[PDB]
Swiss-Prot record, chains A, B:
Mg(2+) binds at N116. This is Endonuclease G, mitochondrial. One of its GO terms (biological process) is RNA catabolic process. Homodimer; disulfide-linked. Interacts with crn-5, crn-4, crn-1 and cyn-13. Endonuclease important for programmed cell death; it mediates apoptotic DNA fragmentation. Belongs to the DNA/RNA non-specific endonuclease family. The active site contains 1 hydrated magnesium ion that has only 1 direct interaction with the protein; all other interactions are via water molecules. Keywords: Apoptosis, Disulfide bond, Endonuclease, Hydrolase, Magnesium, Metal-binding, Mitochondrion, Nuclease, Transit peptide. GO terms for molecular function: DNA endonuclease activity; double-stranded DNA endonuclease activity; endonuclease activity; metal ion binding; protein homodimerization activity; RNA endonuclease activity; sequence-specific DNA binding; single-stranded DNA endodeoxyribonuclease activity. Its EC number is 3.1.30.-. It is found in: Mitochondrion.
Length: 238, 238
């Protein structure tokens, strides 16, 4: 199966899991967005087939209960884009595959100018470009709701919710990418970027974090089924 | 089976489910506390055997990964009690049953004077008192993180996290209680109380909500597998 081929190195969690044609998603009934999504790219899979992104329509995934759905109206005039976790550009092999990347379960409220349309997209483009020199590539993407130290010396998680459905606006997003460079051996790259305007001059390497930090902040077990010795490079090191 | 006996009317969720001796719990790797607990009561099960709560100890359940565990040190000098979601006093039929209610998975950071020790406990006693005039009784309890409309006209969820493990301090707690009064006929009671000091003169009935508000706030499906026609009483009405 295509799902087992994607989820080969572990499910980060097993909450409300949905297997689409070309990616896997875990949906959070509370935040009205994803816990995480997982993708598998090969250089062959990054080659386009009469497939058209202009045909795609933002809509909910109605396999989830009605009361836990985000709707296009939650995102209208909110100040945020509907930002795709599993990117459209990664799924080019059928119309339905890419159509599904426009399901609102794969959307999180994202700052547009300076993030989604810019620095975040850069990180997506980086992964595809790197996926081209590798045998297999696996990417986990998802929202974070990170605590901050405030004035009174205590820590608070604060995040906006938008719309009547109260879809959560993540403070940050993570992205873990696992690239198979030679059979059995992998490069690992972990990122946490703020859901905020980032100046086009900042390089993505600056948002490098350990994989341990993503796991703790996200409440997720990432690439749990991969032997750590098979990793020959974490964030550009070793 | 006992878990099947407890979960007769439905799982609110399936996230990190741990079935203990006498209750069922869903743990949240992110908040370091529970999504929900489920309890079942009969008049028989509210009778004591030689079992003593003084024997119990606050510890984590190490069946959960270490990075997702809350520790006693997180609650120490935090301003909060270890508030049991599944109450010790609902579990009087064995020593192991009660011992388990002192797992940190069953604990949430709660205000002590005016809540845990005071208004929440009354609600706990209320459920027990009713459980005695009823054939069967089912209780779902869990924490909530509720958004607030602020001055800028935007909504935010904001909550404190305590300890080095960053355990969430919930904004509110819910409790839904399903009492079987005659065979296949039910009285439904739903509550939401704020994790705050509540004056002892407020009656618990003042915290009634529709079941829908609990489902929407918590992102859970409570008693979903129950015929609404089986319910003959909602929050004191009909
Ligand atoms: Mg995007
Ligand atoms: Mg208590």
């Amino acid at each position: 199966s295509r799902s087992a081929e994607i989820m080969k190195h572990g499910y980060p969690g097993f909450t409300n899991v949905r297997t689409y044609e070309d990616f896997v998603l875990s949906y959070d009934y509370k935040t009205r967005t994803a816990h995480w999504v997982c993708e598998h790219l090969t250089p062959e899979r990054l080659k386009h087939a009469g497939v058209d992104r202009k045909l795609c329509e933002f809509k909910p995934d109605i396999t989830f209960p009605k009361k836990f759905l985000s709707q296009n109206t939650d995102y209208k005039c909110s100040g945020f884009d509907r930002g795709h976790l599993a990117a459209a550009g990664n799924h080019r092999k059928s119309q339905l595959a890419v159509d599904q990347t426009f399901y609102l379960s794969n959307m999180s409220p994202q700052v547009g100018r300076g993030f989604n349309r810019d620095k975040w997209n850069d990180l997506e483009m980086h992964c595809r470009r790197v996926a081209k020199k590798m045998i297999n590539s696996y990417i986990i993407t998802g929202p974070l709701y990170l605590p901050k130290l405030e004035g009174d010396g205590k820590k608070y998680i604060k995040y906006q919710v938008i719309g009547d459905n109260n879809v959560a606006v993540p403070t940050h997003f993570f992205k873990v990418a696992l690239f198979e460079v030679t059979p059995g051996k992998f490069e690992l790259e972990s990122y946490i970027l703020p859901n905020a305007v980032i100046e086009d001059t900042v390089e993505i390497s600056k948002f490098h974090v350990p994989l341990d930090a993503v796991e703790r902040s996200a409440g997720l077990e990432i690439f749990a089924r991969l032997d750590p010795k098979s990793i020959v490079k974490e964030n550009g090191a070793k």
